From a paper:
LAPs of the [name] family of aminopeptidases are bilobal proteins with a highly conserved C-terminal domain harboring the [name] activity.
The TbLAP-A--actinonin complex had six molecules in the asymmetric unit, and local noncrystallography symmetry was imposed for the protein chains. The electron density for the ligand was generally poor but sufficient to build the actinonin in all six chains. Their densities varied slightly, so that the ligand was modeled in each chain individually, with variation in their conformations. Nevertheless, the actinonin coordination was identical in all chains and differed only slightly from that in LmLAP-A. Actinonin in LmLAP-A and TbLAP-A is coordinated by the Mn2+ ions and hydrogen bonds. In both structures, the two Mn2+ atoms coordinate the O-2 and O-4 oxygen atoms of the ligand. In LmLAP-A, the side chains of K299, D304, K311, and D389 form hydrogen bonds with O-2 and O-4, and the main-chain oxygen of L420 and the main-chain nitrogen of G422 form hydrogen bonds with N-1 and O-13, respectively. Superposition of the active sites including the actinonin molecules reveals the high similarity of the conformations actinonin adopts, with the only difference being in the hydroxymethyl-pyrrolidine moiety, which forms a hydrogen bond in TbLAP-A but not in LmLAP-A, where it is bent away from the corresponding residue (A424).
Numbering used by the authors:
A (entry chain D), B (entry chain B): 3 to 521
C (entry chain F): 3 to 189, 194 to 521
The structure:
């Protein structure tokens, strides 16, 4: 039994995540010119675009423009912002001055990046919002790109985060009182509906909120309750295998990892079937390690800092699934959340233990901190073998390896994929969404020998360290796919793209939405 | 309460160890020539001996010999094998070809080694069995050494291990389906009976099985049940002091170490008295740390890999005892198993705790990972003071220190002994059995000062590292001997000889059998 | 400087590398059946192929086949070998028995690998040669693949290495007396395959050799020896000349060492109209001790391999000349020892690169990119022509092994077309490759420096390390250059547990072959 006060706090936090709606609205120049009549929404306005786009004639005719803003556009450095004051410009707050902030987006974009450069867009708007005069206002963000999806996510992930514990916000279920309503204004009427872009943005910021939150708030239990809350709200099926049931029912992997912890591990599977004929049957699986302490292979304090992020794969596939339901994307989805805390205690699984996986294959544990692949190997077997349908495509997302960062870096998720066509599709989706990706070596013939075990079918870690580590971890997961399954397997290592110096990025959901969108 | 499924698995595993019988039979050339009539047992046959022995005239007259095998004997490198095919040679499996594998054993053997070189014999047979055409067959291993005991153990420890979790053998109580019946064929009828050699081989492979097994199968509890199972089977007395009873009854050492763990520590004492007059009264004590995680002095993951082996001393004295009973060796034995898990948790004994040992002397714990000597100090006090007799000789066996490997290495167990005569005897037994040993410095005057404590009688670790570490650990154990005891004390550090790159070696039992045999 | 005895030894070693010719010959079943008349070349014979290929009818009709070999083919495990004795089979050595060794090659091959699986082929033949009855014989290796180039290199890199110091071979200029003549028998010209094989084994020999034999000086003398032999131009900028002439990078790195650093540029122009103008640049760190950022002893073990990029581009160039490939080639070897001493470049020093840009040294052990940045500027700016393609090869980063592994070299490439071409060449040659992220917009910020143009190392460690090192090199390209840049990180593929692999030369030969 938890203390009564802590249960009150946790309940409040669950509700805050279930009832979270975004702070971002979307419109266009013409529709703004009619709805607002040229009156600005508050004492701040932001303008963002490429060097050439800021010098387009249409910019002059915007309602905040004046000879100062024109100079600001001259003076601004690429990648940076320039602010100016304008006196007596008509505005809803009645402020004698209005602050205009220009920001220049670069046009340079390599073949493996999103040509819109939403990464910079996010930074520019974050900078501009740092000079905010009053909180709980509405800030007009005029963008000059028409790439609506990437920008929508880029602005959603920007500025101050919706999760906060500062200045007594712990008393208000950790909802930031410092967030500004943001009204994005595209040149054209969008391409995608405003009500749709708002969903994508909500999913990005919910993913962000979950990831950000500390493990004393977001436990295996509260994450499950949140999924349940959304299941009741949007009307989809939820299946939960909790604690010792996992051992009874053959799920040795997720059980062994999570059994040490105070809050029991759970395999939470969600289900959505669209009205009409689905274009593809897709199964999602997320690594949901709510805190990776390392187990008995205890991490040193420096590497254990920010391990609340180890749930980031689960939060991605979850919020990606929530968008699909809300928009009624015509994809038949399973979403399986592998929830556990890799904890240290009397009941820790051990460096030498042998696990009997739900696949039936045995795993010699060399290192308890390689927990992610074990928990996923049960997740992917569940999806390919225990569900009411066989998927065409399996997508597993996880904050799996440090090797990821060394190979593909902080902005690109690593792809271990068994088919060129599906790799290409997910890659394309990265470029379109702005939540980019890149391939790591697919070569099972060289990965398998690294897992030779004396007494088990396989180990959970490479014999040798410097031999395609992002890939070998991916291979391990594939060995626990059902032999029923013949289709396409996409493993997504997103260890670093989930976070930056300001906290979580909400990376994952938008990438999925865009991948689904083009099947 | 464990999960129902895990209890079923554990029970199955207990039974598999209790009812384990060997896969090795033994006979001689003449007896084989008459029983088999020159028909080979399967599509594989192995021939092993020294350079001179392979060129003895008697080899030609063997039933698999031909002009190819004669060339194989020329071509073979010392320490290696050479395989050849022979067409239409009569055999029980009806295979068109029979594979003959020659292996050359070296004759070089230093004063501290076994002149037969069973180490190489084990390797040669392991190599030959790697080309096995069908599992569950019978392979004829023709050896040309008459040193029957060392060869018997050497073949028992060789090839694929009886413990296995591969290819669904987890469903069959972890019994390997991949093992070959091995029929050893000596030149002469063996100096020891075949029914006796089979026991020695069974003990070696049981020891092997226990050590190999992961700590999730072999717990303090299941090990105790195994001892009990054998006690009911062979009719000897078993005494168990479990969990908190240890604290109540003054056993502070073994209690403190093991109390953190999920499964409680146990001091299991076994007793055997032969029908007539015993030649000697011997007390065995084994370090039975089922997993050494280090305690609060938590081991780094690399050094914690393979710590399921830390029980290896207990498994040695246990299986050594089982052989004595089964062969009815005329030795009066006590066998005390010091079973605990050095675990990490809320209830861990601490680096600064003071233990009150069963000896009555107080121990300041400097480092919780030096758990072995504490546990043994209670074990040896129990044997020298609480039993129905006072032993003439105390033998304690343990996987005690890393220092062992630095000093005596992977093949020789370290001996800390208080009397030259007993050191000599155990050394002799090493050379005869092939489970070899070597002395480490005995010099208590220089060991004692390393354990000076401010507030306790002693510490559990040296002030200075690099002052006869194998020995100092031995000394600690001697301080907890009863003052009643005045006989011979043999401390056996077998940290490395218990294992190799293939897993456990079953080192210990045969050394004991041979030591007992020559009192 | 040196003792008279050591100079004698070094000279002998130089000559051994210059006059090295391969031990491998190539032929086919029909041509062997006619030349040899069915008499085997020695008391050993080897048979290598896939599960289905070993069961093809044509195998039966081979001159060593018998009912035992047929069982050996049954008994063999995939990836392993099985040996058998055959009595009185006709053979050149007159041995009462002949040993036949079968080896089974797998057919499983992922999209990023060579379908022939020459990796396994190499292992199989190495295993079979371990049971050799007499050295200095000729062993008949019957292969059942027709993928001639990858197999030729695979057999060249296999078995006992030509460099050896065992059993007094130090007295015979470190030439192994334990090597077998290998006659490969298939079911490209033989004189051409022999060159590719010679290049693979020369690359191997250079890499294997210890840094007390292969110094910056002896490597340069070897290049000179080959320049005199095959008639091509050689340009050498030695020691302090590098400082005088603006080459701050390669000078600073190598100036601490006993033997001075050298920028050795080689030149070849084919008789007709070249299909492309290509400039090669190799990291030639003869020993990477780390400099003042001294490596720990474990990571400094096997750092004689840090020259492996140079040995690749050098031997790749030698093949091009010998076969007269119609490519106009520059080959620039960046030779230095990253040494520790009174004159070590320092962690805080600022280098003035030949490019003109300034480099703040954060860590002296990131020596490779500095040395290469001068190499690629030399090629793109100081030569008699402007290349269409720049290929730089180096044993550059440990990150490589984490990202692409032991069998695939990492590719940082600025154009999809050239990446594709080099990738294809990998799959064909068997010296495989794989891409690492190309994204300069994210790499550049990692090199921000307070007082210099750039640093030589990332601010942050976990951010596409194989790629960032590549980017550094691109900043020192000439602005004259607008063509295709291929950076090849081959840190791990150059070696395995048996020593050097001779990885690089065959990959180039095959890339050139199709341009
Ligand atoms: C020993 C295996 C531990 C598991 C892999 C972990 C990640 C993890 O625990 N996921 O649950 C990791 O990032 N490991 C890194 C790591 O082991 N590698 C792989 C090779 C070098 C280095 C990369 O940083 C470092 C940061 C600890
Ligand atoms: C403080 C630990 C005291 C117990 C010695 C332990 C062995 C142990 O845990 N036994 O249960 C050990 O690991 N010994 C080694 C060790 O601590 N030493 C002492 C100096 C070098 C080395 C000797 O092997 C390690 C490094 C493998
Ligand atoms: C810090 C500067 C390191 C310089 C580059 C070296 C390799 C080198 O010196 N080549 O000359 C490297 O990557 N070394 C590795 C290394 O430092 N890294 C970088 C990140 C983690 C780890 C392995 O990639 C290991 C092998 C020691
Ligand atoms: Mn993790
Ligand atoms: Mn982990
Ligand atoms: Mn221990
Ligand atoms: Mn210990
Ligand atoms: Mn280097
Ligand atoms: Mn270096």
């Amino acid at each position: 039994t938890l203390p009564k006060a802590e249960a009150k706090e946790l309940s409040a936090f669950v509700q805050s995540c279930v009832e979270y709606k975004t702070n971002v609205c979307f419109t266009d120049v013409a529709a703004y010119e009619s709805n607002q009549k040229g009156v600005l929404s508050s004492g701040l306005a932001v303008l963002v675009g490429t060097h050439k786009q800021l010098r387009d004639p249409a910019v002059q005719r915007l309602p905040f423009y004046n000879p100062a803003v024109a100079e600001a556009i001259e003076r601004v450095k690429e990648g940076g912002t320039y602010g100016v004051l304008v006196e007596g410009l008509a505005n809803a707050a009645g402020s004698k001055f209005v602050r205009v902030v220009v920001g220049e987006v670069p046009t340079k974009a390599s073949r493996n990046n999103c040509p819109a450069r939403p990464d910079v867009v996010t930074x520019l708007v974050t900078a501009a919002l740092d000079e905010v005069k009053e909180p709980n206002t509405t800030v007009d963000v005029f963008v000059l790109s028409n790439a609506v999806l990437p920008i929508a996510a880029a602005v959603a992930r920007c500025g101050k985060h919706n999760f906060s514990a500062k200045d007594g916000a712990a008393a208000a279920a950790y909802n930031s009182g410092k967030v500004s309503r943001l009204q994005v204004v595209f040149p054209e009427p969008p391409a995608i509906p405003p009500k749709d872009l708002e969903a994508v943005a909500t999913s990005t910021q919910l993913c962000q909120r979950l990831v950000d939150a500390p493990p004393n708030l977001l436990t295996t239990a509260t994450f499950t309750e949140i999924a349940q809350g959304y299941a009741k709200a949007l009307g989809f099926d939820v299946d939960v295998i909790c604690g010792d049931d996992l051992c009874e029912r053959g799920y040795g992997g997720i059980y062994s990892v999570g059994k040490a912890a105070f809050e029991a591990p759970r395999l939470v599977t969600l289900l959505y079937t669209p009205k009409g004929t689905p274009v593809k049957k897709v199964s999602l699986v997320g690594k949901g390690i709510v805190y990776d302490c390392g187990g008995l292979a205890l991490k040193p304090a420096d590497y254990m800092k920010l391990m609340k992020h180890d749930m980031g794969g689960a939060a991605a596939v979850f919020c990606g699934f929530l968008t699909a339901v809300r928009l009624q994307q015509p994809v038949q989805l399973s979403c399986t959340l592998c929830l556990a805390e890799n904890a240290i205690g009397p009941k820790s699984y051990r460096n030498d233990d042998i696990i009997v996986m739900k696949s039936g294959k045995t795993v010699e544990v060399i290192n308890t901190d390689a927990e992610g692949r074990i928990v996923l190997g049960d997740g992917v077997f569940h999806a390919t073998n225990e569900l009411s349908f066989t998927p065409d495509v399996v997508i597993d997302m996880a904050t799996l390896t440090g090797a990821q960062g060394i190979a593909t870096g902080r902005h690109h998720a690593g792809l271990y994929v068994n088919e060129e066509g599906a790799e290409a599709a997910m890659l394309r989706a990265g470029r379109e969404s702005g939540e980019t990706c890149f391939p790591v070596l697919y070569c099972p013939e060289y990965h398998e020998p690294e897992f030779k075990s004396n007494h088990a079918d396989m180990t959970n870690l490479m014999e040798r360290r410097d031999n395609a580590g992002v890939s070998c971890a991916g291979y391990f997961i594939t060995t626990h796919l059902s032999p029923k399954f013949t289709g396409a397997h996409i493993h997504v290592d997103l260890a670093y793209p989930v976070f930056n110096s300001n906290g979580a990025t909400g990376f994952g959901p938008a990438l999925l939405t865009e991948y689904f969108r083009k099947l």
